[PDB]
């Protein structure tokens, strides 16, 4: 059988500080967060309060743990309840048309859960862009505290007739109901393939087999031999032991560091010892240079 022994853990992709972050940046200014050089981590998300929705666009959710990604930004923000609709490709809406806008080409997540259980207070620090004069460019944000100018009469940094501050706040009323509850919502930026593996899918390590003829892969090193315990002692940083022929000899088990030998299969030549076929049809077979088991 085959041994694929990728190292122990090899890191985990951290979207917990994105999903569990204590103070989310609000919807109107959303986090964009580099998760990289790790292993796809949907395994923290199994035991959880339960994200009020889970939508991740691009590919199958079991390709999350099977498919590596490139530029991984899990977008940490808080939105009002109905606004999960308003977070998607092609959305006409307040969130999309103004404060938090996502591309039509975005491959990744939109995920809701109620923060009324937490983010609610009276918290008016939470805010949104109620009006803006265009849609945000892909993954772009609009930070403007600038006056929203309704008429050709310049407001000049003070209020006046139809002089607006376009950003506005959500008053959170601790009696908030399902329509009025904030939803913290997160979005994973990623390009799928075409760039190096940052969310490298947990890569299956087949159970380590010992003292048996196996076809092994260790951290990308492939070979077929008899893996045994061995007393030869590596230097810590090293990977492969070798031999005079440059052929792979000893290896180090990544998940638990141990020095494994390697060896050829039985091989040798078959040899048919016979008296002349004139005497007998009986033959005695000699297997050359083997131990009598694999027969």
């Amino acid at each position: 059988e085959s041994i694929v022994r990728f190292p122990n853990i090899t890191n985990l992709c951290p979207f917990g500080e994105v999903f569990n972050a204590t103070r989310f940046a609000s919807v109107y200014a959303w986090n964009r967060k580099r998760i990289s050089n790790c292993v796809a981590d949907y395994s923290v998300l199994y035991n959880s309060a339960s994200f009020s929705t889970f939508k991740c666009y691009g590919v199958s959710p079991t390709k999350l743990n099977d498919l590596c990604f490139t530029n991984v930004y899990a977008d940490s923000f808080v939105i009002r309840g109905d606004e999960v609709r308003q977070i998607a490709p092609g959305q006409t809406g307040k969130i999309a048309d103004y404060n938090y806008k996502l591309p039509d080409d975005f491959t990744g997540c939109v995920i809701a859960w109620n923060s009324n259980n937490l983010d609610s207070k009276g918290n008016y620090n939470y805010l949104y862009r109620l009006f803006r004069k265009s849609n945000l460019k892909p993954f772009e944000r609009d930070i403007s505290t600038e006056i929203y100018q309704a008429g050709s009469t310049p407001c000049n940094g003070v209020e006046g007739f139809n002089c607006y501050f376009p950003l506005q706040s959500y008053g959170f009323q601790p009696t908030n109901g399902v329509g009025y509850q904030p939803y913290r919502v997160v979005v994973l930026s990623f390009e799928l393939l075409h760039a190096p593996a940052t969310v490298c899918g947990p890569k299956k390590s087949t159970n380590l087999v010992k003292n048996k003829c196996v076809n092994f892969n260790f951290n990308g090193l492939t070979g077929t031999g008899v893996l045994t315990e061995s007393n030869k002692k590596f230097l810590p940083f090293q990977q492969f032991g070798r031999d005079i022929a440059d052929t792979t000899d000893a290896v180090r088990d990544p998940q638990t560091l141990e020095i494994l030998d390697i060896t050829p299969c039985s091989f040798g030549g078959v040899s048919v010892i016979t008296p002349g076929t004139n005497t007998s049809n009986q033959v005695a077979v000699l297997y050359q240079d083997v131990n009598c088991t694999e027969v």
Partner: antibody
Framework: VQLVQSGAEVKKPGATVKISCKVSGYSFSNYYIHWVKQAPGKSLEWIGYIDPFNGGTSDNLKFKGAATLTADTSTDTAYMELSSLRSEDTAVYYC?????????????WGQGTTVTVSS | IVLTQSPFQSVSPKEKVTITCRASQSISSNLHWYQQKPDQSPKLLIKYASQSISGIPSRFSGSGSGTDFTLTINSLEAEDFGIYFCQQTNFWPYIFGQGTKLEILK
């Protein structure tokens, strides 16, 4: 008003079943489709919602068939591919018309699709 | 975020029955009631936990209080009873009631 499903699918466990939910009688693009499983003599179980305009296939995690909901907008037909079949997946698979809105109602459904997953 | 129903209720014609949908921890003021006839697609009785889709008997009502959502039938008919379901929405996995088979005696 009309949701018509592909007939019963009998597979060996581990194989794949894909099931067609054919829309008629309404606008496909204006409604998500819920996909509802009833294990025989057991309760209603919702495998996911799909979007007509998009690949918005949410998946509940109660069981896992590597499922993906594909909707054919020309034929208005949402498919449910249920792979890695298990003898417990044996059930009547309903598809349910859902709002495209943030609200969730299934007023009208398919007729149900029994799948017998067994050796 | 999982909801609880009573597996069975047996009542008599004209008598009032109430079947509960009991969700764990938080609840959502929307809920959806379903009458499943044997071997037949469940049909939505109550939408938003307060309304009937059109054509559904006026004896079919719904509600909720605290974490419970009631399926309330007034003045049953022996044609009426069936397997009953409720629904959890906005929670991602849509947990539907375990189901309640209603019996009508007499």
């Amino acid at each position: 008003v009309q949701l018509v499903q592909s007939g019963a699918e009998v597979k060996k466990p581990g194989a794949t079943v894909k099931i067609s939910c054919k829309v008629s009688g309404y606008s496909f693009s204006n409604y998500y489709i819920h996909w509802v499983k009833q294990a025989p003599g057991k309760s209603l179980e919702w495998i996911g919602y799909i979007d007509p305009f998009n690949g918005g296939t949410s998946d509940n995690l109660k069981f896992k068939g590597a499922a993906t909901l594909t909707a054919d907008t020309s034929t208005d037909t949402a498919y449910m591919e249920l792979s890695s079949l298990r003898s417990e997946d044996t059930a009547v698979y309903y598809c349910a018309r859902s709002e495209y809105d943030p609200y969730y109602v299934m007023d009208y459904w398919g007729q149900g699709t029994t799948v017998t997953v067994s050796s | 975020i999982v909801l609880t129903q009573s597996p069975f209720q047996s009542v008599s014609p004209k008598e009032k029955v109430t079947i509960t949908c009991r969700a764990s921890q938080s609840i959502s003021s929307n809920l959806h009631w379903y009458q499943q006839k044997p071997d037949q697609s469940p049909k939505l009785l109550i939408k938003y936990a307060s309304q009937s889709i059109s054509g559904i008997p006026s004896r079919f009502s719904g509600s909720g209080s605290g974490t419970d959502f009631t399926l309330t039938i007034n003045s049953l008919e022996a044609e009426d009873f069936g397997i009953y379901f409720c629904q959890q929405t906005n929670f991602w996995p849509y947990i539907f009631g375990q189901g309640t088979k209603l019996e009508i005696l007499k």
